[PDB]
Design a protein around this ligand. Structure first.
Ligand SMILES: CC(C)CCC(=O)N1CCC(c2nc(-c3cccs3)no2)CC1
Ligand SMILES: CC(C)CCC(=O)N1CCC(c2nc(-c3cccs3)no2)CC1
Lengths: 188, 194
């Protein structure tokens, strides 16, 4: 029933650890899920739709975790960046394949865009509240500062996870981001 | 002869303004450059090699311009020094948006493009780190993060942020605000004690 959908998703994430989406066939996903190819087509219209569902789940998991946190200043930001570091860090294969699919899937590009706008708006609201209580100085427009900081974390977190040359080592990427966020949000 | 190569490059950059590489054929590039298809193949093995060459020229132009800046005293306050350096990339890539966009896309599918980008990123990060170290050495910047790791995150920020702005991504910093936004983050993060 639903456990069949879940088996297809788990198979896909498992195979994506090994190869790109280009080198995984519906036949591949059907076999690992223990179903036939036409049964697979009952649950998903394409291998692309499988990835989109995985990414949606990972992105919603980071988002929910950030809402949970939301509901010292350096430590507050570190805890928030850490939600993304851990969530996407725990699903590296999906992260890497989802980021690649942005260039070829409008639904993936729109999903990413929607959540980026949400995370940027949350970041700017917190900066504004810090400015309101007199802990942060009124320097750049908060939304513009939030946008560049979130774009930084996207590129840098994901370069690290994929082992890009160049990238910050994964064991140093959290301290690196937190320094840049704290000095740029609080720095006069 | 060489003017044929340059006409093929100019044709490709022009067509990239309106359509992606996938919607440009070799026939299109030959037609715009005033040559036949087999003549095109004399100059380039593929439409991919044309783009790789365009990107190589753009990336080398930014790089030569950063070298020119670096070799001057250029005496200026610290914020102004970083602004002038970020401005080289803002102007150079900003002047070739279609090539920048297509070349960033082609990183996914071309090992030669991926390796080109990677080579210059490492060079620009190393120059940034060396400048941060010299600043630390003279006592203008505090010793906070490892200079190379700070340099890496800052350059990766500029790559994603400049290129999101150029492409009009949602979300992105408006192109008229992006220079000021980057310079603020570089200055506070390089000089900020906290
Ligand atoms: C763009 C993704 C890959 C990374 C997103 C990221 O690193 N963030 C986005 C929002 C963040 C934020 N945290 C908060 C906090 C509120 C209360 C504790 S953290 N508000 O916004 C932290 C950094
Ligand atoms: C990854 C590309 C798009 C980043 C380009 C970038 O904005 N840079 C790279 C290096 C830059 C740098 N400037 C300098 C200067 C030396 C003397 C005046 S500026 N050293 O490193 C400034 C920012």
């Amino acid at each position: 029933g639903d456990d069949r959908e879940l088996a297809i998703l788990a198979t896909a994430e498992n195979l994506l650890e090994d190869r790109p989406l280009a080198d995984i066939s519906v036949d591949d996903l059907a076999k690992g899920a223990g179903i036939s190819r036409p049964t697979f087509y009952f649950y998903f219209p394409s291998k692309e739709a499988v990835l989109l569902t995985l990414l949606d789940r990972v992105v919603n998991q980071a988002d929910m975790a950030l809402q949970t946190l939301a509901e010292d200043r350096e430590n507050m930001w570190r805890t928030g960046i850490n939600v993304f570091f851990e969530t996407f860090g725990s699903h590296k294969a999906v992260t890497r394949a989802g980021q690649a699919a942005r260039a070829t899937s409008v639904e993936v590009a729109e999903l990413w865009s929607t959540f980026m706008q949400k995370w940027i708006a949350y970041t700017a609201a917190v900066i504004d509240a810090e400015r309101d209580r007199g802990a942060a100085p009124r320097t750049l427009p908060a939304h513009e500062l939030a946008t560049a900081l979130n774009l930084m974390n996207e590129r840098t977190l994901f370069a690290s996870f994929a082992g890009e040359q160049p990238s910050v080592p994964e064991a140093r990427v959290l301290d690196t981001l937190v320094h840049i966020w704290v000095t740029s949000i609080y720095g006069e």
